[PDB]
């Protein structure tokens, strides 16, 4: 395994790399980083070139200045240039949380770049808007996104050793036994090196806080209403931030889809239940 950088779209992104062959590109979300995919890097690097990006603003990736540097079009072009720049015309794209927000959008816009899509807990462009409009449990669960618009939130997250971030990821992870002391160490270092301003900047371009914005069909603008490539969802049913109903009626938007629901996993199945997750990924990849 190696740690490398690539210059794309006006920024230098740090990434973890292992293996050779076809590209399996992993995109984390908030407030994780490339390390969340460690169990998949290990498992799939004998048959694939496994690459896990630190998204712009995160860990050792560059932290470009201003909200405009974290807009969906910019993030989407990042991914396109990573695939090309690493010498590929297509990949298997594996996404979670904010990375799914971006990855889903990228897939709809650039299906030819995506051989197969594997998505963990996170917003599907169309169904998420539907659940914001209809589901009081989702509305509640997603209230933090409105709060994140506030200039006080950065202090909240950084206060006293990233207390805010520890609440989200470390405390649950330690209780349940899937983060070792070294994992906690890696996460803390990632927050020291990363930028909480950059991490929050993603959220500050979101257009889902207005009665008529909530009326938009998709989280981010899309001309494409159907995604026709093979897709696998791997979903932790206990996720407090995304309700199970995000998956209802998804076939309308993604006709060739397979869904695997984990009854005993929450927001991040990939490192909560890596063994079960990996076998489902193999099954899908080999279908």
Q: Which residues contact 53 (CB under 8 A, 6 or more apart)?
A: 13, 14, 15, 25, 26, 27, 28, 34, 61, 82
Identify whether 144 is a catalytic site residue. no
DSSP 123: -
Q: Is 97 a catalytic residue?
A: yes
Question: 32, 54, 97, 239: which is the annotated catalytic residue?
Answer: 97
Could you tell me if 13 and 56 are in contact, meaning their C-beta atoms sit under 8 angstroms apart? yes
- The whole-angstrom separation of Cα 220 and Cα 104 is 10
How many Cβ atoms sit within 10 Å of the Cβ of residue 139? 15
Q: Which of 113, 187, 202, 203 is catalytic?
A: 203
* Catalytic annotation present for 178: no
Active site residues: 97, 203, 267
């Amino acid at each position: 395994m190696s740690k490398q950088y690539i210059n794309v779209n006006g920024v230098n992104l740090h990434y973890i790399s292992k293996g050779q062959g076809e590209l399996m590109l992993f995109l984390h979300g908030f407030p994780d980083f490339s390390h969340i995919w460690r169990h998949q890097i290990d498992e799939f690097s004998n048959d694939f070139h496994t690459v896990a990006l630190d998204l712009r603003g995160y860990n050792l990736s560059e932290k470009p200045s201003g909200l405009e540097s974290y807009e969906i079009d910019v993030l989407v072009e990042d991914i396109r240039q990573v695939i090309e720049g690493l010498g590929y015309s297509s990949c298997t794209l594996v996404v979670h949380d904010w990375g799914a927000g971006i990855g889903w959008t990228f897939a709809y816009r650039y299906p030819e770049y995506v051989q197969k899509l594997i998505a963990f807990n996170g917003p599907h462009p169309y169904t998420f808007m539907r659940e914001l409009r209809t589901n009081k449990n989702q509305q509640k669960a997603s209230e933090y996104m409105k709060w994140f618009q506030k200039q006080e939130v950065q202090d909240y997250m950084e206060r006293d050793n990233f207390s805010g971030l520890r609440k989200l990821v470390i405390d649950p992870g330690v209780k349940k036994g899937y983060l070792t002391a070294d994992d906690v160490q890696a996460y803390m270092n990632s927050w020291e090196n990363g930028s909480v301003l950059s991490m929050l900047s993603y959220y500050r371009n979101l257009k889902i806080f207005t009665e008529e914005d909530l009326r938009r069909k998709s989280l981010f603008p899309l001309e494409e209403e159907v995604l026709n490539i093979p897709v696998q969802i791997i979903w932790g049913n206990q996720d407090p931030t995304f309700m199970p109903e995000n998956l209802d009626g998804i076939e309308e938007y993604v006709p060739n889809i397979s869904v695997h629901r984990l009854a005993e996993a929450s927001h991040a199945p990939q490192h909560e239940k890596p063994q079960e997750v990996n076998n489902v990924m193999w099954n899908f990849l080999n279908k």
